[PDB]
Amino acid sequence: MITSAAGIISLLDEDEPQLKEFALHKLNAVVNDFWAEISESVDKIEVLYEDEGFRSRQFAALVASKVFYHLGAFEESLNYALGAGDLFNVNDNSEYVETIIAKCIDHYTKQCVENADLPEGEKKPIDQRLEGIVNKMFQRCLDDHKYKQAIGIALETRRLDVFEKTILESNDVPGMLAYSLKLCMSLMQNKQFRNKVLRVLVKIYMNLEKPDFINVCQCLIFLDDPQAVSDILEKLVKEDNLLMAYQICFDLYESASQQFLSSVIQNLRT
Amino acid sequence: DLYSRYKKLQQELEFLEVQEEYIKDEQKNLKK
Amino acid sequence: AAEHSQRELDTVTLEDIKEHVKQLEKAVSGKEPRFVLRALRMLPSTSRRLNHYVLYKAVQGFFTSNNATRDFLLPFLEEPMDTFRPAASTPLLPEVEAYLQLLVVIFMMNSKRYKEAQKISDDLMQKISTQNRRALDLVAAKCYYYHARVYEFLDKLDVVRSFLHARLRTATLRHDADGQATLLNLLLRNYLHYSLYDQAEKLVSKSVFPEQANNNEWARYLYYTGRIKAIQLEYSEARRTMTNALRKAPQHTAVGFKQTVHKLLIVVELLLGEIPDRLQFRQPSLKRSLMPYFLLTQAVRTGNLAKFNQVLDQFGEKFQADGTYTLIIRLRHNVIKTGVRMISLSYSRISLADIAQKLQLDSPEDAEFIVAKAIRDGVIEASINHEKGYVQSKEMIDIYSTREPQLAFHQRISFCLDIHNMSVKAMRFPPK
Amino acid sequence: GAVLQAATGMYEQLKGEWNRKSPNLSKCGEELGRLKLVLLELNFLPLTKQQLILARDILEIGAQWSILRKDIPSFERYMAQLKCYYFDYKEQLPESAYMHQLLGLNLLFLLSQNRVAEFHTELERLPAKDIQTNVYIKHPVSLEQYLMEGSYNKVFLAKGNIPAESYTFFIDILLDTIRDEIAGCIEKAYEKILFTEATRILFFNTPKKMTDYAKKRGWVLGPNNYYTTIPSTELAKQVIEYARQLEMIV
Amino acid sequence: RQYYLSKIEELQLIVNDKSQNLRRLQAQRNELNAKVRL
Amino acid sequence: DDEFEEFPAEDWAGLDEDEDAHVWEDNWDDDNVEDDFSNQLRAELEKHGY
């Protein structure tokens, strides 16, 4: 039974690549037993990774990823963990896998917000691998049917596409719509993203088979979109559901501002 | 549930920070 | 007669353990760390008693939700034939069940039964690997420590290395301190026990010990790193660390700990040239135990190779018994440097012929080479004048007006300021 | 199986050419190269006792060939892998007659590049009954004790007391290690050192060699053949820090 | 999923620490304000 | 506190008899060898006259 990594790191110095593949397999087998010996010899792993002519530079990237994951240098651990590629089995329940997944989520949320506030001309590109792997978190959550958690991560990541997909494919459309509305009103602050999210729920509400026009009108008042609510009132008038129209207008009077009501009246007048 | 609890935790921490800075400033002024 | 006293002690231990369990529950109540070290602080004193009747009553009282985990201890547990829940079927707190399993393990341990204790400790860790609560992190530290104590007397420490590594990493990810400290100390003992000193040293360099960790675990870590750097030849930092640890060592208990620490600090000192103080060779709890090392120190201070050889031949089993036989080899080879050390402390200047005469070196060139090697290290400060033969020491300039007091005072005042700041942060006013 | 028996005969041929007075280095070299390449397929490190005997003998012949081939960077790797193969957790293979030989060789090599701490750890690794008994490590321990005491002249006498011809290869480089260490000691021990006495104590028998070793360092010949402030910033930062810890509340 | 729980417990420990600190600071400000008022 | 049971809590044999059990605390220079005082002075002084 193994006693240290000295033999393996000594094997690492050898020239023929196939022996390097065997030693990297052994290192991945045991890096959670004695990380220290390879921690000081991680420079070999970096120079292994940066080589284009290597046929398995991804395995070197993964080995260095685990090494830095031990080292606490979680920034370089995340870098060389993204460098691991598809060998990073998301479905795995490894502690290294779990923590790098969590740090991927954190980095993706940070990058997403820092790109969302910034204008279009200065958006720093998100790495493709982190976007895909976080998409694999949304897919895994949907398969595990933890739709609320996927909604929350989508809101963290400013991903309105993932949010819209999560609401659409969710089993309970009205309940999830209500939960999202409550969260959006009571817990999130950024105003422009708030307007975009409210437009998302408005679109989902109107595309819903029996539109919850009370909630749609509430979201429109919150959005200050008099033209849309005027068109919706016209649609209700032509659609004969007069009780909807009456309750909606009473709600607008109780809730919407005087400017909003005057503008709606003018739109209804014209 | 889980995400709402996380958001409430972060909001409570932020409010705690506001109270912390306020109390420090008031401590300085009260010392003066 | 004996049964009456046994029953009264069983009842008082039942009440004390009930206090412990209630303490766990009002520690998990209030969602706070601490007040659980108030729970685990006196498990040695309560584990002193550990009778069968009290354990069975506690099992039947606080495991009213009879589970398979309670039904695994029962086979090995000997329940009394003829024989309290403080009361509904509320699910048991995982901290409470872990603590109760801990006392069951410790009773099953003190009775010289090891294999079943091995299995039961394994099942204790298999369930503790599932919890992710900080309330079960300070408890889990002591479960880990007593588990490794169970395993130690079964001579199977190597198999635990993977588990300790995994849980230490789990603690580091969760920023645990008590669990991290216990696991780090235990795994350093694992590495040194199988003589993996290089592995332990390499692990030490990339692992930062938490400053908040409890005093005894800090002393253990200091001892382990001091042994590592003493067998790694970092003698100055070694002695500094063991002096610190002895300052942190318990005064009353840990007789074996203080004995081993005293032995290794003695050898480290006289390897560096420092002579251990005679008073530590005088306390009754240490006198006869260091008597082999006391004769060692007598030979070292006398420096006669004849008595040195007789002492080695008489006490080599004790010398290796502490993993110091190679250490005492370097000791036997550094006694000459020690001799040169007092020679140069006594004399400002001394001819190398006089060095050879007082040290029995039989050659001025041999004395020159030996003194040059000694003065290479920070043992003697001098200025060798080979024009005439001087070993003229550096002028002992005034320590005042030399900025050295300023630096020492800066370090000390920084220490006091940190102490005051931590004290004022630890006021911890209550809600009501 | 079949590859293992083929490799058994193959390293029989390897050691047969090797133990010959002066093996043709190319044949055995390509042999052990492809032999380790297939040893990767023969379960290199963790198992049949003969399999580990085979792999351990591969690495032993390779390490002694590195002695013969005179390559240190490969020598270290053969050392580490077969250390994972000599004496740690192995316990199923028979005690190799060539254990202590290379324990001593590795210790002396480690001393050759100023690795006294690591060397001392390896000394600790091997059993206590053999330091003062087994001559294959009595020659290391005697020499290194003389080194530590400073009795370098004892080393100069005992350099020929090696227990096997497979020592002089780095006995010579140990002879250079001790002389460079001694030169450093003289440089940081003296203020000015005369030409004649320097040539006498630098262990460079050729005065030309002594002059080259003198030019190799900045420690120069000499004319007659005879070789603070108040920083007020860091301390000011310190007092400002003290004031900070007094102010800004807790 | 488990990432949510880990973040929640980390924020919970941080919040407990900061709440205990805030209680301490509130007590200090209370005594100092009482002195000023007196 | 941990009794450091990882370390064998070294029993002091059978609490046997000590050396003297005194309160006479000594130093490192009290165990050297000397040969009285008068003889030192005289034997060192006949080389110069007493």
Asked if the Cβ–Cβ distance from D84 to A4 is below 8 Å, we say yes
For an interface test with A, the pick among B1, B3, B7, B12 (most A C-beta atoms closer than 10 Å) comes out as B3
Chain C residues in contact with A94 (beta carbon < 8 A):
none
- Is A149 in contact with E1 (Cβ distance < 8 A)? yes
Inter-chain CB proximity B2 and E8 less than 8 Å: yes
Chain D: residue nearest B31 by CA? D249
Q: How far apart are CA C216 and CA D248, in angstroms?
A: 33
Beta bridge partners of C390: C385
Tell which residue, A139, A269, F32, has the closest CA to residue C304. Answer: F32
Q: Which amino acid is at A219?
A: C
Nearest to A34 by CA among C209, C220, C147, C169: C169
Could you say which of F10, F18, F26 has the minimum Cβ distance to residue C287? F18
**How many alpha carbons fall within 13 Å on the CB side of residue C129?**
14
Q: Using CB atoms, which chains have 3+ pairs under 8 A with C? A: A, D, E, F
Boundaries of every domain in chain D = 2-245
**What CA–CA distance (Å, rounded) separates D80 from D84?**
6
Cβ pair B12:E15 closer than 8 A: yes
- Name the resolution in angstroms: 3.2
Closest partner residue to C231 among D120, D151, D245, by Cβ? D120
Binding partners of F (≥3 Cβ pairs within 8 A): C
**Angle CA C51–F6–C201, to nearest 5:** 155
Q: How far apart are alpha carbons A147 and F14 in whole angstroms?
A: 70
Chains that touch E (3 or more CB pairs under 8 A): A, B, C, D
Tell me the nearest-neighbour CA distance from D175 into chain C, angstroms: 16
Report which DSSP code applies to A73: -
C-alpha C215/C-alpha E25 separation (Å) is: 27
Please state the φ and ψ torsions of residue A206, each to the nearest 5 degrees.
-75, -35
Contact of C301 with chain F, judged by CB distance below 8 Å, is answered with: yes
Taking the Cβ of residue A103 and every Cβ of chain C, the question of whether any pair is shorter than 8 Å is answered with no
Q: Are C367 and C355 in contact (CB under 8 A)?
A: yes
In chain D, whose CA is at the least distance from the CA of B26?
D249
Region at C12 (left for phi over 0; alpha for psi -120 to 50; beta for the rest): alpha
Rounded Cα distance, C245 and C268, in Å: 14
Amino acid at A48: L
Three-class secondary structure of residue E23 per DSSP:
helix
**Cβ-based contacts of E36 with chain B (< 8 Å):** 30
What residue in D sits closest to C197 (Cα-Cα)? D121
By C-alpha distance, the chain B residue nearest E2 is: B2
Helix C352-359 with C364-376: angle, nearest 10 deg: 90
Phi-psi region of D81 (alpha: psi -120 to 50; beta: other; left: phi over 0): alpha
State which amino acid sits at residue C115: K
CB-nearest partner of C373 from D185, D191, D193: D185
* Least Cα separation, residue D237 to chain E (angstroms): 28
Look at residues C186, C211, C188 and name the one whose alpha carbon lies nearest to residue C198: C188
Buried b / exposed e over D112-123, threshold 16 CB at 10 Å, is beeeebbbbbbb
Subunits adjacent to chain D (3 or more Cβ pairs under 8 Å): A, B, C, E
Flag if C202 and A40 touch (Cβ within 8 Å).
Answer: yes
Instruction: Report which residue type is found at A215.
Output: N
DSSP H helical ranges for chain A: 6-12, 17-29, 36-40, 42-49, 57-71, 74-82, 95-117, 128-143, 147-156, 160-169, 173-187, 191-207, 213-223, 226-239, 242-255, 258-269
CA C321 centroid distance within chain: 18
Beta bridge partners of C384: D190
Q: What whole-number distance in Å separates Cα of residue C201 and Cα of residue C355?
A: 39
A127 sits in the region (left: phi over 0; alpha: psi -120 to 50; else beta) called beta
C-alpha gyration radius of chain B: 14
Nearest to A148 among B2, B8, B11 (CB): B2
What is d(CA A136, CA A116) in angstroms, rounded to the nearest whole number?
Answer: 21
The two three-digit tokens of residue A224, written as one number: 């200050």
Query: What's chain D look like in SS3?
Result: CHHHHHHHHHHHHHHHHHHCCCCCHHHHHHHHHHHHHHHCCCCCCCCCHHHHHHHHHHHHHHHHHHHHHCCHHHHHHHHHHHHHHHCCCCCCCCCCCCHHHHHHHHHHHHHHCCCHHHHHHHHHHCCHHHHCCCHHHHHHHHHHHHHHHCCHHHHHHHCCCCCCCCCHHHHHHHHHHHHHHHHHHHHHHECCCEHHHHHHHCCCCCHHHHHHHHHHCCCCCCCCCECCCCCCCHHHHHHHHHHHHHCCCC
* List of chain A residues whose C-beta atoms are within 8 Å of the C-beta of residue E2: 98
Cβ(D193)–Cβ(D226) under 8 Å? Answer: yes
F10/C contact by beta carbon, under 8 A: yes
Which of F10, F16, F27 shows the shortest C-beta gap to C256?
F10
- Residue D153 CB-density burial (10 A; 0-12 exposed, 13-18 middle, 19+ buried): middle
Dist. CA C17–CA C103, nearest whole Å: 9
Chains B and F in direct contact, meaning 3 or more beta-carbon pairs closer than 8 angstroms: no
The two structure tokens encoding residue D138: 């009595």
Identify the three-state secondary structure at position C390: strand
Question: Is D198 within 8 Å of D185 (Cβ atoms)?
Answer: no
Q: CA geometry: angle at A34 spanning A33 and A40, to 5°?
A: 150
Whole-angstrom Cα distance, residue C234 to residue C227? 10
Q: What chain A residue is nearest to B2 in terms of C-alpha separation?
A: A149
